[PDB]
Design a protein around this ligand. Structure first.
Ligand SMILES: *C(=O)CCCCCCCCCCCCC
Lengths: 459, 128, 155, 111, 122, 79, 87, 220, 171, 177, 62, 65
């Protein structure tokens, strides 16, 4: 895993010694080279995972997340170079360094075999994200959003540290392979109940769970575009990955202890979806859609069946790609019209036809159109939850309506109808925005051809 | 004779059947004159700053910003916890959660009881 | 935009009501705020609760699709009452009449279908007869087990 | 057996060809509706042949030509089942679509 | 359709129901009643892949009609004689079915007459 | 580019049902001032329209003649 | 489909349908003939004239513009404005 | 599903009785046809339903082409109260629309007769719901009613369109496509009904007042 | 090609064409045109490709795994032997999944081949499918997403305990 | 009750609007033209019977009763012209109505295909920017203090100038572009 | 160049997917399964050559 | 050439369209008459319907008691 950490940490001299006019070109070129290099993690075996040393390993669950992260960094570099065009050079280099540090922390978080190292860099991912949100956010409410995000995460995740140190003192090790071969059942006691709660609540907050999701429609809105990409495409999936890793040790208490939380998502993904029917804000609409999809992921993890696990992996990857693309489209509209409200700019298909095509395709992939991997993940979670209980299909099917009921709604008021008369600064679409949309979307449709590389470690 | 038309929430009264339209008092004339004056002022401002050949951009609307700030950022400071808000929050917040928890717990308890007694048909069920 | 243009708390004194009506570009006697039940409405006005289909379709609006004017205080549920969504336009017949007629028609059809299901219609013929013990082997019956031989006689 | 499957999948591939033709376009197409109408008429003939073969013999076939995804016990492949229903419904739909597209190229000329 | 009105508006003691039939033994009132005999063995009709609904007592003309349809391609309109034989045989089977229905109805009528006669006599 | 109209005096309501309704209105003490506007509707090629039975049996004569010669040919060609 | 219109064509149309009115003498009216001033018509007759205009040209004139057209040339100007004639 | 199909076809036919938009009338017509397909599925006649699909597609599409021809010839005027006297003005559209209406109603030895009537032949002599059979017969009468309503209001009578007349149907594409679907709606039902293999036992022994139920219902 | 013992198929029985009319069927003419215009160039191109492949030959092999002692002879909390036992168990699990897949493919092939007599002519395939599904369900079901050899051993031990107890009740 | 020219609707205007909508609905119920003529002349006689009424409250009561009559006698679906609101092809071509300022964003390569049109566009923009300050200075000196009381706009008063606020009503897109 | 639509859009796909079906699909087991041909009393089998025996004499109704 | 738009009068018709319309109507009526002449049974009935009242008790095997 040293072959990816070292070039990522050498990206900082690359971005700090470059000229004032070629930082973007050099950083995008070398991050695309690292994304190409990332494909050597597909050497997965049907029985054994890929173990590199005592410190790092990568099974078939971490590999799609690593490839997605190192593919996502150049996309952020291309997106965040227009609202920072007038910025000072030193602050531009500091922003690029924050992005590089965030990628380095993420790609060594996804590969740590030891759990306290995973916790340490899982919380080291807080600092660059928070700095980006509270520094390069636009309006006044970025400070409150940063406070909410940081304090929800830390107040949920300090008992996780306490529980992990207790595990290290009790079992004797925190290596994931040793814990895979030394796992003991957890009996029925109040101590084990709070053990389960301390292990679960950090990832509950970072998923987010309904009722603990109040930091999402702030931090996903006040942040800049690259902050929106990392907020919607990696960190939520990082919480899901941690949940998948740590649910191994919490058997068989989970078989009843997951009983409330499933309801807190099974109803929750209804309510937040209904919020998208009556949202006056485009970015808030995308954030609440992310809440609903990740609640579906929560249910899939908590019922702990194989089909649900592969559905959760495919759903996480597909939702990350789709949410990043939707945030890019909303940011392009916000750059053109200088307001975030959805009803201000209407009828943009008459002026911007190809961006309307990208909008249509992104909305179609949002509402789980087959044979996309969004539909594959949603379908597999549906099969597993039907095996769990029958009436759950109702809670699925109604959601299958409401999702489309906002997605096409998001397609209409932003693209269809009569255009706004007084808005006359609708410039034609740049090559950069179209290239960003294509680089977001074409990997998703190509992954629809060969989905078996994202179907989890038990495929 | 003819059936009288009554209003509803989803079917309002027609304008022509409204008695208040036929009231020709001078106070109604003053009210309509003031409303027309307000509308003419706003229209004149909008089409004065809208027909400008120099301006390129968005003619911003204070009413839209007012509506968005009222809909999103003004809900909490104007909220006071009383009996109505607390009863509505408890009725619509933890009601469906308890209902669905009881439904799913009952169904899965019955299913587990049937499964462990060898009663439920699970012949070809090998994918779960 | 300035801080005194945003909505504020619920007005109680008449001068605050006058300043609120001045802020929202409407007459003082036409400005009725929402009741102060602590639901977060604040000083936003309570509009007459009509859909955008009820507006004049021939008067030239600033937004012709939305049927709306620049600077007009928009409804709290304008995102609900657009022409793509729920309409409140008057109907030729009464609402309760429509509900009663539709419910009665549905109930009558359901009851009549139940009555017809209880009392079916058939033909005055005997049951259809198949050879070889009602096709015992062709119906998936195992050949090792011998069934009861049934037979059909001519009439 | 070899004529059957080849002609049926030729009908399918011939139908999906003009989508790639318009997606890989650079110029202004020299009456693309005529190209689509000709393609669909030719596909109607190409699907009329195995319908005639089924009428003569009574052949039903299943082509699981591309294995897609093995979800442990479950196996999902690109499988086409052509029986009475599919083989008698494809050419009727093709004939109707041929007439509809000719009416469309007259009716939607000003678009 | 007067049988439906007889059963529904009159009484159902005489009118036979179509759910289960017959409610009488075939040797009752029929000395030396012989059974219907197939022409088609089960093996040849199995290899002809007939529908299980079509695997009835008159499958011989069905097999003949299918052989005509397979052998006369592409001249698809000159196998009318074989299908005429087939649906004539099916008409005869329908006649047998309604004959059995009338036999059941008359036996139930005789039951009602006999039981009322025995109730009045004693 | 250039459009030419017929004479405006040629439209008369006589014979059409507009004459009947004008006479009925006169019998009721009224008048119809717009009969000449749509006097064109009942005059010309738009007059003498067929009924349902006439429209249903359109082309029945030639079809019956074709049926006659076809059945005669099928009679003769068999023997 | 949809043959083009012209100003003298639509003027000929409105005059041609105007001389078919039994309340109007065809030998007196011109293109600047007022209805209740130069022809002695009525407001209801003006309403019927506007409905004849709508049934002639196939599009409905709104009432707030129907209460303003008082001469045949005004109807010509309104139809020319609404149909964008003489490009 | 038999009850649902009968309810659907009766409801849609009764809605189509007093409609005034031509495309709305044809929409309710094809929904009533789909209800009849649901009905004949519900009485264990699936191959008859498939034959009815293949039969119905031809004349339903052809009726829509005729409707589009009348719409284009009258400058996008879809209301049925503003059209009339089009029997002689547009003769090919008139002929195709008349043949399509006759095939939809169930005229003998057209395409619909080879499927739709047979459905009623299984709807009477089978163990069915009585109410469903009664309402599907009433629905058949309603299909006849709205078909001749379309014929009378669209084609017969006197004109009601505006004074400028731009009636034209002389284009090779429209004439050729209407001709192809006219040949289809004339002969394809016969061809398919005589070409498909028997997948069931046909029911033909039935009384005379059950054999001619559909034709009498259509006539009345 | 494939092996016919793993994938069984009955020898086919094709009837001879004995026409009763004089109209020539277009199927024979179209078939002759198919081996004229299509089969000959395709076979020529395949012959050229096969000659080019016979010019340069090399081989590949099916990987063979020896038997390592399973979890029943592994000391507890001794990762060195339990790792090998778990790897062997997972390899076996994948192999059994593909075996059940093969039997399902056999059943579907039998149903499609038999057509309208499938519910009589495919009794053996259905019985084989039922047997392999019963054994798979008794071997691998209800383990969870975190399945291991220890959970399978515990399930088997519970099943044998239940079977022995039920035998003891009826003895 | 919502007009750009007048603040309110007079009694005669209400009567004329009622006559218009009643005649339209009667034409909807009476599809054949001669029957429509009979009942339209009957409605004209019924409106002419109470024409010379001088008591205003009696006229208002008759108007309210006639409104009740009309609402009882509506067509459930009346005839709408295809381009009027509620019609079959209302606002159908609004996807084709591209505003002209998009022509400012055209590339010079595609601007070279229409030289004379863009020269005329340049002279039109020059005329607009030459007359804009004259239009606004006319607007300030014409309206009274406290804002305009009506939405009506003044015309071009002097010679050589253009009416105020003319650009978005002259350069509006065609009905069928 | 008069009827190259019958060459590029018809014959080349027939060639390509006939190669694909003959040398890559049917080489794998159970990819293409066809319903076995119908067997009647009175015809001849090509594969082994047995004449199937004819059927029992009809007790004719007509 | 094309068809010029007439005003308040019957529009111009080609001979081809009316000829084809009359030909296809005659073809439909010929088809209906020919198929009713040849088949004549799918509309009126195929086989006689024996009413049950004329069947004797011997063939039904009804015991006399
Ligand atoms: C008794 O009449 C048995 C027939 C089935 C029940 C009655 C069906 C009545 C409707 C169908 C016949 C209509 C004849 C015009």
């Amino acid at each position: 895993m040293l072959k990816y950490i070292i070039p990522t940490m050498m990206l900082m001299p690359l971005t700090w010694l470059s000229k004032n006019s070629m930082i973007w070109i050099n950083t995008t070129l070398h991050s695309l080279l690292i994304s190409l290099t990332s494909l050597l993690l597909l050497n997965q075996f049907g029985d054994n995972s890929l173990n590199f040393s005592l410190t790092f390993f990568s099974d078939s669950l971490s590999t799609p997340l690593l490839i997605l992260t190192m593919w996502l960094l150049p996309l952020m570099l291309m997106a965040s170079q227009h609202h920072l065009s007038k910025e000072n050079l030193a602050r531009k280099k500091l922003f690029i360094s924050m992005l590089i540090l965030l990628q380095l922390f993420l790609i060594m978080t996804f590969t740590a075999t030891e759990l306290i190292f995973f916790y340490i860099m899982f919380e080291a991912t807080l600092v660059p994200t928070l700095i980006i949100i509270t520094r390069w956010g636009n309006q006044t409410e970025r400070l409150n959003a940063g406070l909410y995000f940081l304090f929800y995460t830390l107040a949920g995740s300090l008992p996780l540290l306490v529980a992990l140190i207790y595990i290290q003192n009790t079992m004797g090790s925190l290596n994931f392979l040793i814990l895979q071969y030394w796992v003991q059942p957890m009996p029925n006691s109040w101590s084990n109940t709070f053990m389960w709660l301390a292990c679960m609540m950090a990832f509950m907050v970072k998923m987010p769970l309904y009722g603990l999701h109040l930091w999402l429609p702030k931090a996903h809105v006040e942040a800049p575009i690259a902050g929106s990409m990392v907020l919607a495409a990696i960190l939520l999936k990082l919480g899901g990955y941690g949940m998948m890793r740590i649910t191994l040790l919490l058997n068989p208490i989970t078989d009843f202890m997951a009983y409330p939380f499933i309801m807190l998502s099974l109803w929750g993904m209804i309510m937040t979806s209904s919020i998208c029917l009556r949202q006056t804000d485009l970015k808030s609409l995308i954030a609440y859609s992310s809440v609903s999809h990740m609640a579906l992921v929560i249910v899939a993890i908590l019922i702990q069946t194989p089909w649900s696990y592969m559905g959760a992996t495919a759903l996480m990857i597909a939702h990350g790609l789709t949410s990043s693309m939707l945030f890019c489209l909303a940011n392009s509209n916000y750059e053109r019209v200088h307001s975030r409200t959805m009803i201000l700019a209407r009828g943009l298909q008459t002026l911007l036809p190809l961006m309307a095509a990208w909008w249509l395709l992104a909305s179609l992939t949002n509402l789980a159109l087959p044979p996309s991997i969004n539909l594959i993940g949603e379908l597999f979670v549906v099969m597993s939850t039907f095996s769990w209980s029958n009436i759950t299909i109702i809670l699925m099917g109604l959601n299958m309506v409401i999702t489309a009921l906002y997605s096409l709604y998001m397609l209409i008021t932003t693209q269809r109808g009569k255009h706004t008369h007084h808005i006359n600064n609708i410039l034609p679409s740049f090559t950069r925005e179209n290239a960003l949309m294509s680089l977001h979307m074409l990997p998703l449709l190509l992954l629809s051809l060969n989905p078996k590389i994202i179907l989890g470690p038990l495929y | 004779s003819f059936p009288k038309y009554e209003p509803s929430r989803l079917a309002s009264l027609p304008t022509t059947l409204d008695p208040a339209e036929y009231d020709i008092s001078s106070e109604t004339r003053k009210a309509q004159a003031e409303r027309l004056a307000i509308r003419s002022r706003l229209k004149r401002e909008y089409q004065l700053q809208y027909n400008d050949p120099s301006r390129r951009g968005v003619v911003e609307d204070p009413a839209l910003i007012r509506w968005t700030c009222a809909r999103s950022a003004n809900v909490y400071p104007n909220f006071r916890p009383n009996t109505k808000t607390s009863l509505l929050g408890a009725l619509f917040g933890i009601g469906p959660l308890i209902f669905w928890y009881y439904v799913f717990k009952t169904d899965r308890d019955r299913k587990e009881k049937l499964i462990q007694e060898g009663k439920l048909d699970r012949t070809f069920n090998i994918s779960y | 935009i300035t801080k005194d243009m945003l909505p504020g708390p619920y007005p109680k004194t008449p001068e605050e009501r006058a300043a609120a009506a001045k802020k929202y570009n409407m007459r003082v006697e036409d400005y009725e705020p929402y009741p102060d039940d602590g639901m977060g409405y604040g000083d936003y006005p309570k509009l007459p609760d009509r859909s955008q289909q009820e507006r004049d379709p021939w008067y030239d609006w600033d937004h012709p699709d939305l049927r709306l004017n620049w600077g007009e205080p928009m409804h709290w549920d304008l995102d609900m009452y657009i022409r793509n969504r729920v309409d409140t336009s008057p109907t030729p017949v009464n609402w309760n009449l429509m509900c009663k007629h539709l419910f009665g028609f549905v109930a009558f059809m359901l009851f009549m279908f139940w009555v017809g299901e209880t009392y079916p219609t058939y033909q005055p013929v005997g049951p259809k007869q198949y050879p070889y013990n009602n096709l015992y082997l062709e119906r998936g019956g195992d050949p090792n087990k011998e069934p009861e031989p049934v037979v059909h006689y001519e009439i | 057996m070899n004529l059957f499957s080849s002609l049926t999948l030729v009908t399918l591939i011939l139908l999906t060809m003009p989508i790639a033709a318009i997606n890989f376009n650079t110029h202004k197409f020299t009456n693309y509706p005529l190209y689509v109408k000709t393609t669909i008429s030719c596909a109607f003939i190409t699907s009329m042949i195995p319908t005639m073969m089924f009428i003569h013999t009574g052949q039903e076939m299943i082509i699981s030509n591309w294995h897609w995804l093995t979800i442990q016990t479950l196996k999902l492949s690109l499988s086409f089942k052509m029986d009475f229903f599919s083989m008698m419904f494809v050419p009727v739909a093709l004939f109707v679509t041929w007439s509809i597209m000719e009416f469309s190229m007259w009716y939607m000329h000003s678009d | 359709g007067a049988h439906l009105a007889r059963r529904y508006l009159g009484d159902a003691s005489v009118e036979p129901e179509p759910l289960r039939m017959p409610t009488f033994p075939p040797d009752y009132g029929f000395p030396e009643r012989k059974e219907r005999e197939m022409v088609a063995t089960q093996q040849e009709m199995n290899d002809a892949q007939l529908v299980l609904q079509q695997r009835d007592y008159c499958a011989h003309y069905l097999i003949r009609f299918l052989k005509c349809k397979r052998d006369s391609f592409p001249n698809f309109l000159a196998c009318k004689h074989e299908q005429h034989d087939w649906d004539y045989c099916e008409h005869l089977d329908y006649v047998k079915r309604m004959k059995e229905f009338e036999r059941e109805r008359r036996l139930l009528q005789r039951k009602k007459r006999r039981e009322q006669r025995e109730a009045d006599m004693a | 580019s250039k459009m030419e109209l017929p004479d405006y005096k040629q439209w008369k309501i006589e014979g059409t049902p507009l004459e009947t309704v004008q006479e009925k209105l006169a019998a009721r003490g009224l008048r119809d001032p717009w009969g000449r506007n749509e006097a064109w509707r009942y005059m010309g090629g738009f007059a003498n329209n067929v009924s349902f039975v006439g429209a249903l049996l359109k082309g029945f004569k030639w079809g019956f003649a074709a049926f006659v010669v076809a059945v005669g040919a099928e009679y003769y060609l068999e023997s | 489909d949809a043959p083009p219109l012209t100003l003298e064509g639509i003027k000929d149309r409105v005059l041609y349908v105007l001389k078919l009115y039994d309340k109007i003498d065809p030998e007196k009216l011109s293109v600047n003939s007022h209805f209740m001033k130069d022809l002695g018509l009525d407001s209801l007759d003006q309403v019927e004239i506007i409905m004849a205009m709508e049934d002639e040209f196939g599009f409905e004139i709104p009432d707030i513009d129907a209460e303003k057209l008082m001469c045949p040339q005004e109807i010509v100007d309104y139809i020319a404005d609404k149909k964008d004639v003489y490009e | 599903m038999l009850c649902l199909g009968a309810m659907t076809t009766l409801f849609t036919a009764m809605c189509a009785l007093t409609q005034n938009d031509i495309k709305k009338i044809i929409a309710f017509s094809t929904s009533s046809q789909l209800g009849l397909m649901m009905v004949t599925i519900g009485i264990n006649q699936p191959h008859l339903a498939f034959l009815h699909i293949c039969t119905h597609a031809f004349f339903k599409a052809m009726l829509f082409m005729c409707s589009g021809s009348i719409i284009h010839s009258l400058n996008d005027e879809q209301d049925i109260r503003k059209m009339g006297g089009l029997f002689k003005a547009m003769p090919f559209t008139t002929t195709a629309l008349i043949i399509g209406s006759l095939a939809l109603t169930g005229m003998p030895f057209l395409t619909g007769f080879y499927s739709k009537d047979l459905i009623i032949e299984s709807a009477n002599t089978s163990y069915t719901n009585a109410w469903a059979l009664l309402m599907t017969l009433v629905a058949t009468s309603f299909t006849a009613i709205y078909s001749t309503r379309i014929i009378f209001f669209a084609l017969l009578g006197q004109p009601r369109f505006p004074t400028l007349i731009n009636i034209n149907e002389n284009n090779p594409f429209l004439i050729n496509s209407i001709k192809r679907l006219l040949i289809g709606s004339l002969f394809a039902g016969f061809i398919i009904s005589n070409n498909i293999p028997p997948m069931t036992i046909p029911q033909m022994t039935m009384p005379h007042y059950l054999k001619m139920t559909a034709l009498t219902v259509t006539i009345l | 090609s494939w092996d016919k013992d793993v994938y069984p198929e009955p020898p086919r029985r094709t009837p001879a064409p004995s026409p009763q009319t004089s109209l020539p069927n277009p199927i024979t003419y179209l078939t002759k045109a198919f081996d004229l215009l299509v089969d000959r160039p395709v076979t020529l191109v395949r012959e050229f490709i096969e000659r080019q492949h016979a010019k340069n030959k090399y081989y590949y092999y099916h990987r063979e795994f020896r038997r390592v002692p399973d979890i029943t002879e592994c000391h507890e909390k001794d990762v060195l032997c339990m790792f090998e036992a778990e790897m062997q168990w997972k390899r076996d699990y994948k192999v059994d999944q593909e075996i059940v897949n093969i039997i399902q493919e056999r059943l579907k092939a039998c149903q499609q081949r038999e057509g309208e007599s499938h519910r009589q002519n495919c009794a053996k395939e259905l019985q084989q499918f039922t047997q392999v599904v019963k054994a798979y369900q008794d071997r691998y079901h209800d383990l969870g997403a975190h399945y291991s050899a220890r959970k399978c051993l515990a399930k088997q031990k519970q099943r044998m305990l239940a079977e022995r107890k039920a035998t003891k009740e009826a003895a | 009750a919502f007009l750009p020219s007048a603040a309110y609707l007079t009694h005669q205007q209400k009567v004329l609007q009622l006559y218009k909508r009643a005649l339209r609905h009667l034409e909807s119920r009476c599809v054949h033209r001669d029957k429509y003529r009979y009942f339209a002349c009957l409605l004209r006689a019924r409106f002419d019977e109470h024409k010379n009424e001088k008591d205003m409250v009696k006229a208002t009561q008759l108007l309210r009763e006639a409104e009740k009559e009309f609402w009882h006698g509506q067509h459930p679906q009346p005839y709408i012209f295809p381009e009027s609101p509620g019609g079959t092809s209302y606002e159908r071509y609004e996807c084709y109505k591209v505003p002209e300022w998009c022509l400012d964003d055209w590339h010079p390569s595609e601007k070279a295909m229409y030289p004379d049109y863009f020269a005329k566009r340049e002279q039109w923009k020059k005329l607009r920017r030459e007359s804009w300050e004259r239009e606004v200075k006319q607007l300030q000196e014409e309206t009274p203090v406290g804002g305009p009381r009506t939405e009506a706009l003044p015309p071009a008063r002097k010679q050589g100038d253009l009416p105020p606020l003319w650009w978005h009503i002259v350069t509006r897109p065609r009905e069928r572009p | 160049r008069h009827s190259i639509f019958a060459f590029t859009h018809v014959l080349i796909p027939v060639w390509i997917i006939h190669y694909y079906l003959k040398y890559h699909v049917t080489t794998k087991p159970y990819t293409i399964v066809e319903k076995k041909p119908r067997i009647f009393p009175g015809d001849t089998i090509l594969e082994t050559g047995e004449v199937i025996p004819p059927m029992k004499e009809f007790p004719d109704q007509h | 050439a094309h068809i010029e738009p007439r005003y308040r009068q019957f529009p111009q018709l080609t001979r081809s369209q009316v000829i084809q319309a009359e030909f296809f109507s005659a073809t439909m009526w010929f088809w209906i008459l020919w198929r009713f002449w040849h088949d004549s049974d799918a509309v009126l009935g195929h086989f006689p319907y024996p009413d049950p009242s004329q069947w004797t008790d011997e063939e039904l095997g009804i015991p006399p008691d």
